[PDB]
Amino acid sequence: FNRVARGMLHQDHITFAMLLARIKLKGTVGEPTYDAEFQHFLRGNEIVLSAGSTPRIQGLTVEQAEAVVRLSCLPAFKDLIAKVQADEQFGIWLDSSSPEQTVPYLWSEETPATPIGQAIHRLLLIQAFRPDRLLAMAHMFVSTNLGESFMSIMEQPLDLTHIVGTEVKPNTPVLMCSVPGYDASGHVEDLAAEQNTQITSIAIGSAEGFNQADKAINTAVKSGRWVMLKNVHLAPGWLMQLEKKLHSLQPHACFRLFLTMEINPKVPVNLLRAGRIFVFEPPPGVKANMLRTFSSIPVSRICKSPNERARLYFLLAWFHAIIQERLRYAPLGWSKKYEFGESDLRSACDTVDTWLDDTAKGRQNISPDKIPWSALKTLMAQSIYGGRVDNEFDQRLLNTFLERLFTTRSFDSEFKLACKVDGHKDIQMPDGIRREEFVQWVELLPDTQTPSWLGLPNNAERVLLTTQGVDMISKMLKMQAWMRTLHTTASNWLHLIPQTLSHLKRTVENIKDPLFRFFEREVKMGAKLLQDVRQDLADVVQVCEGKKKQTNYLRTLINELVKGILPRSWSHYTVPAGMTVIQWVSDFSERIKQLQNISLAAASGGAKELKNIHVCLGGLFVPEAYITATRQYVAQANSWSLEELCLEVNVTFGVTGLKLQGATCNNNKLSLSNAISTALPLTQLRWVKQTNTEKKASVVTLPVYLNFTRADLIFTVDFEIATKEDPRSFYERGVAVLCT
Amino acid sequence: ELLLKTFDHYCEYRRTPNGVVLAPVQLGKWLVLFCDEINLPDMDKYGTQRVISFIRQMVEHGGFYRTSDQTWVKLERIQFVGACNPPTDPGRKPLSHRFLRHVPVVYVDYPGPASLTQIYGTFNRAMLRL
Amino acid sequence: RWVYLEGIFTGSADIKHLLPVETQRFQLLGKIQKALGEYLERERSSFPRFYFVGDEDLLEIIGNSKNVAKLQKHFKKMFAGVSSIILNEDNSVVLGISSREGEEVMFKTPVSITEHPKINEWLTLVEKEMRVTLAKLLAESVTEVEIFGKATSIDPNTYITWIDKYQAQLVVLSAQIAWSENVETALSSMGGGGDAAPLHSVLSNVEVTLNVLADSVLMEQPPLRRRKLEHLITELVHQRDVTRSLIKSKIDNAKSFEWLSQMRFYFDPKQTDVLQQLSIQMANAKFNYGFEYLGVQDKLVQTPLTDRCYLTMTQALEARLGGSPFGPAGTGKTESVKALGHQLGRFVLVFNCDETFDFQAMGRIFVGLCQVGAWGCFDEFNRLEERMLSAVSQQVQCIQEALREHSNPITCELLNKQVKVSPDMAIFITMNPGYAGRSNLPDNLKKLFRSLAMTKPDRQLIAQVMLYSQGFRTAEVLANKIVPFFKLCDEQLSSQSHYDFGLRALKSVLVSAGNVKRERIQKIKREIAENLPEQEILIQSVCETMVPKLVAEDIPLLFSLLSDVFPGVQYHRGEMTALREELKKVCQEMYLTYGDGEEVGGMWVEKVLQLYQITQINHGLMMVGPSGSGKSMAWRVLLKALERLEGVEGVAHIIDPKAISKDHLYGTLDPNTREWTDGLFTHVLRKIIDSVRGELQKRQWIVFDGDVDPEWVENLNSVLDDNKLLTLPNGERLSLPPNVRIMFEVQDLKYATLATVSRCGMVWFSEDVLSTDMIFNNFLARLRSIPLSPMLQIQRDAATIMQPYFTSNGLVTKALEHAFQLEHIMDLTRLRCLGSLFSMLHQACRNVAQYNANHPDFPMQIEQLERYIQRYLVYAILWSLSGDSRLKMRAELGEYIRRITTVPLPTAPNIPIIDYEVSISGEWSPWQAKVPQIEVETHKVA
Ligand SMILES: Nc1ncnc2c1ncn2[C@@H]1O[C@H](COP(=O)(O)OP(=O)(O)OP(=O)(O)O)[C@@H](O)[C@H]1O
Ligand SMILES: Nc1ncnc2c1ncn2[C@@H]1O[C@H](COP(=O)(O)OP(=O)(O)O)[C@@H](O)[C@H]1O
Ligand code: VO4
């Protein structure tokens, strides 16, 4: 397990542990094989049930009811339906933070099963009820099978020197596959320096790196010299040649050959077969990340000059880990998947060292309030970590974290690294002076890392955990005419898609109105798209009836439509990436229906009925055009200019279809809530004269995004907050507004 | 390069009196470069056929730029006729509306039933006379 | 090898005494060649800037020791701002250096050519004396500006005397030094002061000198002094803002980061002449000033982003890393990098990186940077191949290793050669993430550079400052109106491929606004006087730059936005009648239609005038419009009109980019011989620069008539931006002469990145611009002349006959629109059908000529001619608008023609018209009478 895990991704380790647990279970003495239970676990969704679903005491959702009725097929599980509705603490267990620790006894067994039997029973119950905790329960099952601390080696930082010197033969190359944003050249350079062995580092390319690499390899086999070839994934043919040459050299002992390369499918399979593979990723969890950072930093560099340096380095490592593994929750954490890596941490270390040495020349025990907090915060927010930050919201999040951590109050005793992780349990600042104190404090961190540590909501991992569990089950399971259909689908699509919508009448008085101009352009673009898609679908129907011939364009359209890929011609408005054709068609139908309603409203009134209508910004080609049109209409109504205008939104022009991501509004103020989304019914967009006055403390700026993928900012709303709330908490929680 | 080789082989004269001009050996005779399947040439990664751009340049501007001396060569007694297929034919790609301006298009369809009957009827009556 | 030595051993007289033993032993091969190369590299090592010059240029330079005037061209590319050197009357003693803008830096200590005859040594001494002279003049200027520092109510006359006394870079340096010293002294005086606020005196001094400059720029000023003033306001407004920020934040001591973060200068002429008097310092980053004559260049409005960029670049240089600004195009990357490289006063070379830069080229460039110590900004670095990015990661790691070795005359491994490395080195790579034609960077290289996100420049402050500097008294309100106007125009207008509303757009608008203001001042003076309406000047600039690229459905939107942002004022097009009469004359000479306003051919005249405007504003132009919109004629007629209106000839080279391989377009560099052969564009540019035939006195107009894709136009990013410079893999840098315009006649910019769209002023030639009646009139005018005298008369009276059928709403137009309503195998293009029709009518005239020749007696008469022509016209319409369609489409067009015509037609009711030809006598004869039922021979069948 350890040797294979050294060269495989962190997502797939749990599956390998599951398979090894199965192998150990089949190798036991007398305990039952539990083949039926594993069969139901691997494929439980495959069982088809038409109308047998029946909710009990309204305690199970549709998915939960389907799961429990599917799982009732197992003979020990015949009484699930009656037993769950006869239990009262089951409701408390369902919404428990960690139900994996305690699973109520529900399965009926004639004889007391072995503890592994109880473990697999609990695994089935967890899969049926709490798919989010499926990873935790699988971890518990692996623990009960292979013993505790079985896959605890993966948490420890990898020891390069011992593995290279013992587990690697000279002929076999050492392969360091690196995910994007990570490079293994630095670690092995440090290894070579530590061993005091001269090493040849060469980057592959330019047709001269090949000759240099060949010469270095020829010299190194008779001398024990180490050799590095960096970014060797751009010359696969030369890499075939390298494998063929390396198969037979019988080189000198202590000789090694390192091949730095990225993870792409264009690397040869035979080289991967013939070499030891090492994969470098962001370590999982804050604990392992702290451990890796502390191992990376030399001991001599810490505990040199003032004793506050160790606490500064611990704060730096905590900040680095927090921002590093917030990247996992990209839609809700950092809006973009940045590349906070090892160079960022090295630059942070260098700046901290230089500024601490400048602020304290020789003298130790510098006062906490004399450390250059402002210098470090600005350098970390504007030059090292903020350099890769593009949008202003991510920049303000980085400023929030830097101001929360890098401060004099961090040297107190009651300073909290995390505001709240359980609502009452707060991560306390370790009262350490020397490095080993902070290191051991890291090592006693509990194994219950929730996203609430990060500032993100506690329920920000449900979807990701369930997806990982489904992927784990799919991996484990993998381990063990179109013409008539297109005819039917095209007919159904043409049926559901409405007919062409009418334009808007161009009059002398309506042409001047900005709202009318915007709506005319909208309906014109919608009509063009509707006509194009309707004639394309009609052409598909005619061809699938066989009467019409085949065109290159028609061939391409059919080929990309049978696969569920949205045609590129139909992609005229901004859409979330990578949906199926059916979802796009439903969205288009809703958009065209709204456009027809707009046309009817304009027909009822040329201008008087164009202001008092409600528009869902989710379905609209260019929402910023709508915002600009409302601004222009308000500016033209009065004598006010466009610039002397600011937007104030009152949640009840009328705007519908908006949803808040984790905020409940009472009247117009905001209060933080644990709900994933909160609907905004009939928001009003009011433009008022700009007063050039600084906003109040309770006022915060929430971005408004078009869809779930926060990748297209529409406009920003300044919301006020209710009593006893902190705008910093709003910013760190990633509250936003979604049109879709 | 195909057209360049064709001109080098048949249009030897690359003479440059008061300007570089390209003409065939056989004086007093024009030259028709019958380019067949003109729309088969693949377009670049950015949707642009190179030889089509060359033809448009050497037809509209009436010449090209030779790579040997970067000098303008003007066509003399040279003309182009192409033969192609409908765009809906698989493997075919439409030409740029910029090239079409200098070349009129004529559509030749398959001979109709009566047309085939009469055309090959004459052939059969000629053959069976043996 | 042998041919090389044979060619190069028979040159000038003294050129052959350069290690002449090979010359005598020639008139073996490897030894001679390597000895010559060793001599070249020795001379290059003697004077580091020789690693920027070519080997042939260097050999000619050494051969031309006696003649110094012929050597006054390589100084432009050896140095940064040096373009000429001032010698004595006897051509023996150099007295100083002259920039290309006519600015002189007289050497404090002249050096004589006779007193050091070798080229390299006297060049080294003139470089050193230039640095020494700049240092001494900076010291004198700082001493002078001390007086303004310790005085209030300063005298404008002496202040302007100081400004035009010294060079521009020295003036800005003195201003910054004085401000830094004053603020440092004030902060030291405050110390732990509870209420002492003497820095308000510094703020008041900045205020009063800024007011003096504002008054001085409102009136007529000399050119160089005008630019010095513009720079000085740009710096002093930043100083004012920084001082206000310091006052608001209430900084007590000079060691606070709120003062340490901002760049501050430290001057002390006490130390020796090692040229270390200046100590430019960012946050804990100590920088020396590598005194070199930059000349007079533009200064950016140090904005909040331009500061963050300064901070990050200085930090990267402190860590001895490189800087990698990244973000959207036109966000101030290559100009901020350059502006910071000139703030420290160091030689900065910008290279436009493309995939043709091989490993040896990068190594040679890096060797030159090592020897000279000059900075390097590699524009569009990601445009290299990924393999080559990985390959040059090694060189970056070697060069940075030499800088890290300096920390412990340093040599680094660069192309199996050990080269001296100076600490002033810098390597910068600007890149555009997520853009077409760009390759991703390896993590190995990406960790060798420090990157920042230059995504959104602060255009409001950029505008307000550039204006305030121009002389607009309400610059604040103007910027507050124009920047939101741009941001609302970006949203309200329809998305188009040629639409650009970024910083490059705002910049072109504000420069045009300044020029318009100057012209209006001149016009008013031809009849102080500062009651101008500024809003209408801005409207004129916007309408002269933004309008020429709007589509026909966007102009109302833009004008409504302008009327809403600027309520109360409007601009009317300049008459330009002195050009319009010339346009009318030349259009008449070219059989093209001319009009004014709502006449026929009026929109086309508006577009050619807009093209003239863009020619005046931009140096790169781009014509976007459907094929057959009059783009080619617009610039042809404009060139022919300007060569008469102004008297300067205009020569246009038309190059098709995609026709030939880009290797032939730009050039090739064989990796073995390392010889550069000019491509097509490079050859033309070199011919223009080397005005042997007076090419610099002609209005050269290079036009790229083809398709724009992000592969070749990206090689022109450096020629179409402020750099006006062409950078080659050979290292050669070709400046764009001011009399050259790079044009691109395209039909669409769909396959183009925003980078090229941002430059090259857009002119949108809509299809409605060239009306069909104009095409008809062109044909008829060409028919009434250009004999295909007797033949000319046959064409004339034929045109007289066909005149009624070519009405704007005549038969041909209706037939054409109906044909566009039908279906064709290929998409119907108007100019294709019209070309076929015109060709067939020309053939009709040839048929008349043939018939007239065939019958010398009884010549073909007018009634017969009119019958024949009026039938051949219908025949031609049918065979031009439906020669590409299937049979029943031809029948449909024939039926439409029959029901909407008055020309006599065949009377048979069933057979379609197309089955009829037109006999030379003028009768609609059937075609089924020319199909003999022949009988093939019994052999050779099929
Ligand atoms: N003002 C005018 N009066 C009459 N005819 C004109 C005028 N301007 C252009 N034309 C005619 O229009 C036709 C096409 O013009 P031109 O070649 O300039 O178009 P274009 O858009 O540049 O075409 P392409 O993109 O294919 O190069 C020619 O027949 C030309 O003579
Ligand atoms: N602070 C500034 N003040 C004035 N003009 C500026 C400023 N920053 C950038 N510009 C102008 O904006 C344009 C940006 O060009 P450049 O920096 O080459 O673009 P890119 O960001 O793509 O490298 C130039 O015209 C430059 O002079
Ligand atoms: O980033 V650019 O200077 O090629 O527009």
Side-chain angles (χ1 to χ4, degrees), chain C residues 292-313:
Chain C
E292 187 167 2
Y293 188 39
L294 312 178
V296 292
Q297 300 152 25
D298 283 18
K299 299 294 183 179
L300 304 302
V301 178
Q302 305 50 344
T303 56
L305 187 63
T306 299
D307 291 355
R308 184 192 223 178
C309 176
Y310 285 178
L311 185 52
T312 297
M313 291 325 88

Side-chain angles (χ1 to χ4, degrees), chain C residues 328-330 333-334 352 379-380 430-432 438 504 714 717 721 755 759:
Chain C
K333 296 186 295 294
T334 57
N352 191 66
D379 188 20
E380 289 305 321
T430 65
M431 45 168 300
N432 279 357
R438 271 76 161 180
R504 282 208 164 95
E714 304 293 327
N717 288 359
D721 76 345
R759 309 124 167 166

